[PDB]
Amino acid sequence: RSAATREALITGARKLWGLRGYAEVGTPEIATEAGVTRGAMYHQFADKAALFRDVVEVVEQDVMARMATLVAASGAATPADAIRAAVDAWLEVSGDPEVRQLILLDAPVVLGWAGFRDVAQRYSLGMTEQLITEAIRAGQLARQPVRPLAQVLIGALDEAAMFIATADDPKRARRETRQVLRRLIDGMLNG
Amino acid sequence: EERSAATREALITGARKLWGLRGYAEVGTPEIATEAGVTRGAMYHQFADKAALFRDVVEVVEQDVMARMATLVAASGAATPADAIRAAVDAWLEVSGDPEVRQLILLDAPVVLGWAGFRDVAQRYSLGMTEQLITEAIRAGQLARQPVRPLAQVLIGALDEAAMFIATADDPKRARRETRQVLRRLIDGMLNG
Numbered sequence: 290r291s292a293a294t295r296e297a298l299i300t301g302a303r304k305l306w307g308l309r310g311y312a313e314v315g316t317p318e319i320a321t322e323a324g325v326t327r328g329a330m331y332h333q334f335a336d337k338a339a340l341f342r343d344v345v346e347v348v349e350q351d352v353m354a355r356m357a358t359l360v361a362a363s364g365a366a367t368p369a370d371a372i373r374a375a376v377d378a379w380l381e382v383s384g385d386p387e388v389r390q391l392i393l394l395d396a397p398v399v400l401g402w403a404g405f406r407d408v409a410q411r412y413s414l415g416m417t418e419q420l421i422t423e424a425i426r427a428g429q430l431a432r433q434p435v436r437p438l439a440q441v442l443i444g445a446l447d448e449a450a451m452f453i454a455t456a457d458d459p460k461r462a463r464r465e466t467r468q469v470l471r472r473l474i475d476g477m478l479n480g
Numbered sequence: 481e482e483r484s485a486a487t488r489e490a491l492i493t494g495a496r497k498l499w500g501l502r503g504y505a506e507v508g509t510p511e512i513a514t515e516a517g518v519t520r521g522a523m524y525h526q527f528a529d530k531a532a533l534f535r536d537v538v539e540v541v542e543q544d545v546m547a548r549m550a551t552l553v554a555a556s557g558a559a560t561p562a563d564a565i566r567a568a569v570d571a572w573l574e575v576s577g578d579p580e581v582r583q584l585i586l587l588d589a590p591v592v593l594g595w596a597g598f599r600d601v602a603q604r605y606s607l608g609m610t611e612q613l614i615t616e617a618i619r620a621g622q623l624a625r626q627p628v629r630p631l632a633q634v635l636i637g638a639l640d641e642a643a644m645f646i647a648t649a650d651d652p653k654r655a656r657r658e659t660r661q662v663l664r665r666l667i668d669g670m671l672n673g
């Protein structure tokens with residue numbers, strides 16, 4: 290009942306904020322999209338931002354699931370190639386207009402830098418650390434502190450995606466950032 | 481007139497010192513006016529609210545940060561662009577570890593300015609020095625020819641994340657030394673020199 294209200298509201302908000310952005314859609318329009326009364330909604334979420342926080346969580350899960358089930362589809366033979374696939378996977382997925390609007394444009398404003406880092410690192414650190422660990426185990430990456438390299442790589446890839454998202458010419462920004470990330474990764478790795 | 485100009489400077493200096501020591505959250509504007517030796521009225525004429533005064537403090541602290549970074553690189557005796565990049569990475573870790581820069585720039589600024597405001601300030605003060613350093617390394621053949629603005633923006637995301645990671649760490653001394661190792665390995669892997 291509570292879970293079904295929550296699910297209906299998250300799906301509705303994810304769709305409409307996805308299309309027009311957080312700032313353009315009010316909570317009552319979301320309630321109607323969800324087939325929920327203002328009252329049922331305010332009982333599950335104090336305000337707009339609180340609902341936005343559950344939308345971010347659900348979108349980040351999908352984004353990480355999409356990326357894992359895209360690296361697996363790359364058929365990378367080594368950890369080094371899996372890191373390269375994972376970088377491409379993130380450029381592919383952050384180019385999704387919903388991920389661009391909710392995660393790259395609205396999330397930083399609504400959550401702030403501290404909040405966004407918490408969410409970003411809650412969802413990506415483990416996958417990033419695991420990928421670094423495998424490259425070390427295979428001799429393709431120098432033994433080196435794993436958590437700090439992971440943190441830095443996630444700051445770079447998040448910033449890469451934000452640079453593309455707000456570029457005058459995103460098609461050009463993608464191809465140029467892709468060249469830059471390929472050089473950064475090739476400079477991080479062993480051969 | 482001249483007293484209005486002196487009030488502005490006194491309030492920025494006083495707010496910079498007290499917010500530096502205790503956070504933005506822990507010092508009200510009345511204690512800042514007293515520290516400055518001026519009236520709430522002279523203060524409200526120069527700054528509409530607390531946040532407005534905080535924005536002038538951020539500007540003055542960022543100027544000191546970039547000046548201290550340029551000083552540290554020039555002081556390193558770096559003969560090449562590659563060595564200047566090595567100095568500049570160390571200089572950023574050194575300067576962001578200053579407790580005033582940690583409190584005002586890493587913890588308070590993103591909250592008080594918000595995302596758009598803070599990014600605009602951060603980019604205004606760091607992009608130019610970062611782009612210039614990359615350009616020199618390319619001109620010297622010590623860095624592969626590549627798009628300058630995108631490499632700069634990626635590197636700034638890495639260095640900003642590095643600084644935040646150390647600022648909030650359980651063991652900042654360890655975080656600094658380990659992040660320093662990782663950044664140095666990354667750039668030693670890109671630099672032809």
Ligand SMILES: O=C1C[C@H]2CC[C@@H](C1)N2CCc1ccc(Cl)cc1
Nearest residue numbers: 349352375379409412413417443446
């Ligand atoms: O929702 C997400 C996607 C973005 C934005 C927030 C955080 C988790 N970010 C992770 C970006 C990332 C991290 C590691 C790798 Cl290998 C690739 C990409």
